[PDB]
Swiss-Prot record, chain B:
Keyword Hydrolase: no
Record's protein name: Large ribosomal subunit protein eL28
GO cellular component annotations of the record: cell body; cytoplasm; cytoplasmic ribonucleoprotein granule; cytosol; cytosolic large ribosomal subunit; cytosolic ribosome; dendrite; extracellular exosome
Single GO biological process annotation from the record: translation
Keywords: Acetylation, Cytoplasm, Isopeptide bond, Phosphoprotein, Ribonucleoprotein, Ribosomal protein, Ubl conjugation
Subunit structure: Component of the large ribosomal subunit.
Organism annotation: Homo sapiens (Human)
Known role: Component of the large ribosomal subunit. The ribosome is a large ribonucleoprotein complex responsible for the synthesis of proteins in the cell.
UniProtKB/Swiss-Prot annotation, chain F:
Gene: RPL32
Protein name stated in the entry: Large ribosomal subunit protein eL32
Gene Ontology CC annotations of this record: cytoplasm; cytosol; cytosolic large ribosomal subunit; cytosolic ribosome; membrane
Subunit structure: Component of the large ribosomal subunit.
Phosphoserine: modified positions: 61
Cross-link (Glycyl lysine isopeptide (Lys-Gly) (interchain with G-Cter in SUMO2)): 8
Swiss-Prot record, chain G:
Domain of life: Eukaryota
A single BP term in Gene Ontology: cytoplasmic translation
Gene that encodes the chain: RPL18
The protein's role, per its UniProt record: Component of the large ribosomal subunit. The ribosome is a large ribonucleoprotein complex responsible for the synthesis of proteins in the cell.
Residue positions where Phosphothreonine is found in the record: 157
Residues with Phosphoserine modification: 129
One annotated Gene Ontology cellular component of this protein: focal adhesion
Covalent crosslink: Glycyl lysine isopeptide (Lys-Gly) (interchain with G-Cter in SUMO2): 118, 163
Protein name: Large ribosomal subunit protein eL18
Cellular location(s): Cytoplasm, Cytosol; Cytoplasm; Rough endoplasmic reticulum
UniProtKB/Swiss-Prot annotation, chain H:
Family designation: Belongs to the universal ribosomal protein uL24 family.
Entry's localization field: Cytoplasm
Species annotation: Homo sapiens
Pfam families: KOW (PF00467), Ribosomal_L26 (PF16906)
UniProt-annotated stretches for the region Disordered: 1-21
Biological process per Gene Ontology, one example term: translation
UniProt xrefs under PROSITE patterns: RIBOSOMAL_L24
One Gene Ontology cellular component annotation held by this UniProt entry: membrane
Subunit structure: Component of the large ribosomal subunit. Interacts with DHX33.
Organism taxonomic ancestry: Eukaryota, Metazoa, Chordata, Craniata, Vertebrata
GO MF term list: mRNA 5'-UTR binding; RNA binding; structural constituent of ribosome
Gene3D superfamilies: 2.30.30.30
Main location (coarse class): cytoplasm
Disease entry from the Swiss-Prot or TrEMBL record: Diamond-Blackfan anemia 11: A form of Diamond-Blackfan anemia, a congenital non-regenerative hypoplastic anemia that usually presents early in infancy. Diamond-Blackfan anemia is characterized by a moderate to severe macrocytic anemia, erythroblastopenia, and an increased risk of malignancy. 30 to 40% of Diamond-Blackfan anemia patients present with short stature and congenital anomalies, the most frequent being craniofacial (Pierre-Robin syndrome and cleft palate), thumb and urogenital anomalies.
Name of the featured protein: Large ribosomal subunit protein uL24
Length: 104, 122, 147, 52, 52, 129, 187, 127
RNA sequence: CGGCUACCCACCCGACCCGUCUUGAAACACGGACCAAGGAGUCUAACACGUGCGCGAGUCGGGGGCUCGCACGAAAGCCGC
RNA sequence: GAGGGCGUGAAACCGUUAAGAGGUAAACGGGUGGGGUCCGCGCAGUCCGCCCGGAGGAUUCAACCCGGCGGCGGGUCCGG
């Protein structure tokens, strides 16, 4: 959430829950245990303020000064799609599948 | 992003049981037990799985919708089939083969349905 | 990371990775840099040539404050000022030139390098090498001193 | 008591990890593979009203 | 870059007409090395001298 | 006569002795666990005949039949119903075995669910009333 | 006994890339597939340079990557770099050229697009040129790495030209005995 | 969740203050709940105990519907003694049996001026 | 009826008591009566090199300041005139 | 089988019972044999699963269409 107004008093003692602001994020809260992918519930003003706070790849972040979004290594990365697109399979040798085991 | 999700989930994920020997994926919509890539239920855009009906009679089949991801309330559409075991085995064969939807894992769905029907009968 | 340390793997061996015969005791050769003339000269010479002796005049109370003269090259000389200026001043405007003041950026002495484009400029610095002065008069700009 | 307890991370990596964790929170197959229960939950990135 | 819409769920749980475009942080790359590394070093930051 | 799994051959073990530590017979402050003798004089390291045999990679068992019970299954430990139901697909090669700290009240429910799913449980009749 | 020949068959090559990075592992999967299904040696070299470590993928500079494409016959050929690209501050004017490389920096992408170019990543490079037709592979300055100016037979004895280790390059630090003729000897 | 910086979550300090609290705190610790009809009548959850109440046991070996009178209160042992609850020894001498006052339901009070004042403070604070 | 087993016994052959200094140990070389618990390459600074990550001719906030007094907050976040 | 230094009670060691053994001090490794405790197996009656040809009843699919929902796959990129 952003703009604290009393949501902390409401959600505070429901057990196991985490209440956490936008402009002060935590890796220790957004990925507890060093595993990625913690479930999250957002808010309207928070979810609008995210793109102001980190930007797109086209415009820089406005609230954080020198920071852009990261570079992206593989642009499209469905490996099955890439291998079964015709541009690769035009240029493949052959499926060689005879086993040719040991002959006594 | 299926391979990204696989390179994150293939180790260090939840479920995953490694106990005295080999790994058992134990995903809650899976065909076989093997933590493998072809037999994956969470990650793929198109997935097939079977489960027992809570009534006790018949086999329910869960097929992923493909119409929208990021919406798991509607992502899995479920049907119930209660037949003479041969008509339901042929029915799941038709529903896999005559659709484009996962031409692999025919026999995974078939063997799991066959085992659950034999376990269900006496 | 004691679990990744070598020492946890080295258990069960008697000498713990220092030999039975040699026996790492306390301080075999000495301490620190013992024997710089006497018995480590084959290391000190052949691995640190010049370690012993005096060379220069003795200068007392030196300040690294009076001799402060950073350098800037004719490669870097453009990007002290935004590239919009060199584009507009290079778009055949008139005989005029932009003034690039390196003392604003924090550089006192302009050294010469290569590749100065033909676009004429005016550079203000405290010091100039005759290389860079020749390069500026060759591209057609001028040298200006300050104080 | 002078053991090197605290460690410093670069701020760009501190922000990179936040971006990576938020990006991993968007995919449904990742977060079910941690152990939450999103089986009967609407959309992944939940966004309620400001009345909350 | 594919930027879908997200429908804002009301407090009753029904999707309203209000829609916010998904920000690019939910399209950022996903790096478990860097998440695990920075998580380790921040856990090292969260402790005291301890029984000496 | 329970379930009779798939084709399991005549297993060979290459030695069935679980090799003893040198001079563990002479003392009782040396437990029976193997440990590589690294002495400078030790006859076990010098491999004199008539002394004990060091374990090494030659004694290893066949990869076809590694971790095989004599009944013909490979063992797999289990605590409860879901981890029993993971073996619903592969029962004819992998037997289940209920952990030691499972109580009897849940243990009989596990063995009953295993009897429905036809999965071999190697200790089914222990800890009952 | 069999071989009185020594044992030194096991080559010290890098089979799996030692990094744990997921995107690099996926590129390894794809280019290993291409190197065993296409029989083009370009795929072999790209696969080995993807295996290769952080040091031996040194960053290309934009001016050198311009100069190697200003050579006669390489205008339409895409300059492919394994490793990263740094933007250069030296040169002013950049031509149109297409570059496929890992992790191009922000200012370098900026001035390539200001020149009007097109960059690509290796998935797009595979979808365009699987045998790598019309591609020129470039390499970075490995010996320009500053650690390689400490390595020689000595730091001083047959002139050696190899920069001894010292704290601060001034007077009174390693200048006196054996570096000048009036004090003892000279090299 | 604890929000004061001047009260302990600490197990050692809590057990130590518990087993060494003096008598005028041990009175507050040895407290009993009132029966639900009496809490309807008086609007108060709990009270300290004294020598002269009428007491029913809710759990133990001695359970249910035996409304007897307390006789002694060992605050040193955190134990009250009830008049009906007995047990013989080997030698045929009866002895009271220890009941902690959390397992105790009060059915009648002893009315006194300070008990009226405490009861009125409870009702006024519950408001 | 089948059974390996750290059960016991029989028999044939091999079979010297371990640790270390040592060119040489079964040594008429030294230490060890037996058993349980404790018991030894840690930490900091500095340097060199290899490795992994981020940014890139830059990079680094490790010193301060900024946020409401909230367990986890001695955290985390931000500064860039 | 918690009896006032009293939870759990290991080893060295000792007593007793049960088994076996005894001239080259005892102990060990390889190889077997004999006995014992105990496990499994049902003890010349133990194999199972599928398909096909035969002897019974009891059900209702299916083949065919109607009705309905959901999903697959493509097209005018129609409608946006
Ligand atoms: Mg060794
Ligand atoms: Mg030494
Ligand atoms: Mg020797
Ligand atoms: Mg040989
Ligand atoms: Mg050798
Ligand atoms: Mg304490
Ligand atoms: Mg000596
Ligand atoms: Mg001698
Ligand atoms: Mg010896
Ligand atoms: Mg001795
Ligand atoms: Mg002695
Ligand atoms: Mg110990
Ligand atoms: Mg380094
Ligand atoms: Mg006890
Ligand atoms: Mg006791
Ligand atoms: Mg006898």
């Amino acid at each position: 959430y952003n703009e604290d107004n009393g949501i902390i008093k409401a959600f505070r003692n429901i057990p196991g829950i985490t209440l956490l602001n936008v402009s002060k994020l935590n890796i220790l809260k957004l990925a507890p245990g060093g595993h990625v992918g913690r479930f999250c519930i957002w808010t309207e003003s928070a979810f609008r303020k995210l793109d102001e706070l980190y930007g797109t790849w086209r415009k820089a972040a406005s609230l954080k000064s020198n920071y852009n979004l990261p570079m992206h290594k593989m642009i499209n990365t469905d490996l099955s799609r890439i291998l079964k697109s015709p541009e690769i399979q035009r240029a493949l040798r052959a499926p060689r599948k005879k086993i040719h085991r040991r002959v006594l | 992003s299926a391979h990204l999700q696989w390179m994150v989930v293939r180790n260090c994920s939840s479920f995953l049981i490694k106990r005295n020997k080999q790994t058992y994926s134990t995903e809650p919509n899976n065909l076989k037990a093997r933590n493998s890539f072809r037999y994956n239920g969470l990650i793929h855009r198109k997935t097939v799985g079977v489960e027992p009906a809570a009534d006790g009679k018949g086999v329910v089949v869960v097929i992923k919708r493909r119409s929208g991801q990021r919406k798991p309330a509607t992502s899995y559409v479920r049907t119930t089939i209660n037949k003479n075991a041969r008509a339901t085995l042929s029915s799941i064969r038709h529903m896999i083969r005559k659709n484009k939807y996962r031409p692999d894992l025919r026999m995974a769905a078939i063997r799991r349905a066959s085992a659950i029907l034999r376990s269900q009968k006496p | 990371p004691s679990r990744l340390r070598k020492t946890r793997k080295l258990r069960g061996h008697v000498s713990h990775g220092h030999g039975r015969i040699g026996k790492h005791r306390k301080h075999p050769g000495g301490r620190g840099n013992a024997g710089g003339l006497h018995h480590h000269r084959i290391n000190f010479d052949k691995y640190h040539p010049g370690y012993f002796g005096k060379v220069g005049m003795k200068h007392y109370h030196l300040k690294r404050n009076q001799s402060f003269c950073p350098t800037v090259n004719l490669d870097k000389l453009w990007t002290l000022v935004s590239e919009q200026t060199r584009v507009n001043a290079a778009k055949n405007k008139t005989g005029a030139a932009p003034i690039i003041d390196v003392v604003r950026s924090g550089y006192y002495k302009v050294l010469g390098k290569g590749k100065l484009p033909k676009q004429p400029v005016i550079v203000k610095a405290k010091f100039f090498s005759r290389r860079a002065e020749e390069k500026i008069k060759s591209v057609g700009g001028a040298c200006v001193l300050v104080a | 008591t002078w053991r090197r307890w605290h460690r410093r991370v670069n701020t760009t990596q501190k922000r990179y990890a936040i971006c990576s964790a938020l990006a991993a929170s968007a995919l449904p197959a990742l977060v079910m593979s941690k152990g939450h229960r999103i089986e009967e939950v609407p959309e992944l990135p939940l966004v309620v009203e400001d009345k909350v | 870059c594919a930027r879908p819409l997200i429908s804002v769920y009301s407090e009753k749980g029904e999707s309203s007409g209000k829609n916010v475009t998904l920000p690019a942080v939910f399209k950022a790359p996903i790096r478990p090395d860097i998440v695990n590394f920075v998580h380790t070093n921040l856990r090292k930051n969260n402790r005291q001298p301890y029984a000496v | 006569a329970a379930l009779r799994p798939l084709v399991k051959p005549k297993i060979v073990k290459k030695r069935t002795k679980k090799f003893i530590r040198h001079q563990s017979d002479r003392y009782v402050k040396i437990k029976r666990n193997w440990r590589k003798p690294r002495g400078i004089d030790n006859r076990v390291r010098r491999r004199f005949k008539g002394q004990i045999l060091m374990p090494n990679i030659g004694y290893g068992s066949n990869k076809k039949t590694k971790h095989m019970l004599p009944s013909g299954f490979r063992k797999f430990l289990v605590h409860n119903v879901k981890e029993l139901e993971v073996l619903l697909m592969c029962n004819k090669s992998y037997c289940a075995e209920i952990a030691h700290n499972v109580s009897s009240k849940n243990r009989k429910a596990i063995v009953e669910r295993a009897a429905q799913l036809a999965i071999r449980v190697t200790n089914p009749n222990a800890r009952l009333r | 006994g069999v071989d009185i020949r020594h044992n030194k068959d096991r080559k010290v090559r890098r089979k799996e890339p030692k990094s744990q990075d997921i995107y690099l592992r996926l590129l390894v999967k794809l280019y290993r597939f291409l190197a065993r299904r296409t029989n083009s040696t370009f795929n072999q070299v790209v696969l080995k340079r993807l295996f290769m470590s952080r040091t031996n993928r040194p960053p290309l500079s934009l001016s050198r990557m311009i100069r190697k494409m200003k050579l006669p016959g390489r205008e339409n050929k895409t300059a492919v770099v394994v490793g990263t690209i740094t933007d250069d501050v030296r040169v002013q004017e950049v031509p149109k050229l297409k570059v496929c490389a890992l992790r191009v920096t922000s200012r370098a992408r900026s001035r390539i697009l200001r020149a009007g170019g097109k960059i690509l990543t290796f998935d797009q490079l595979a979808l365009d040129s699987p045998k790598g037709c019309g591609t020129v592979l470039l390499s970075g300055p490995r010996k320009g790495r500053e650690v390689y100016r400490h390595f020689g037979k000595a730091p001083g004895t047959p002139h050696s030209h190899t920069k001894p280790y010292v704290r601060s390059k001034g007077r009174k630090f390693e200048r006196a005995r054996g570096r000048r003729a009036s004090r003892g000897y000279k090299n | 969740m604890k929000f004061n910086p001047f009260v302990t979550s600490d197990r050692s300090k809590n057990r130590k203050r518990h087993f060494n609290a003096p008598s005028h705190i041990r009175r507050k610790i040895m407290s009993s709940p009132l029966s639900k009809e009496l809490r309807q009548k008086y609007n108060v959850r709990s009270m300290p105990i004294r020598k002269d109440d009428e007491v029913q046991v809710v759990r133990g070996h001695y359970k249910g519907q035996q409304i007897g009178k307390v006789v002694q209160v060992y605050r040193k042992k955190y134990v009250i003694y009830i008049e009906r609850v007995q047990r013989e020894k080997a030698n045929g001498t009866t002895v009271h049996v220890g009941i902690h006052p959390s397992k105790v339901v009060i059915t009648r009070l002893k009315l006194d001026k300070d008990r009226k004042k405490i009861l009125e403070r409870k009702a006024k604070s519950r408001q």
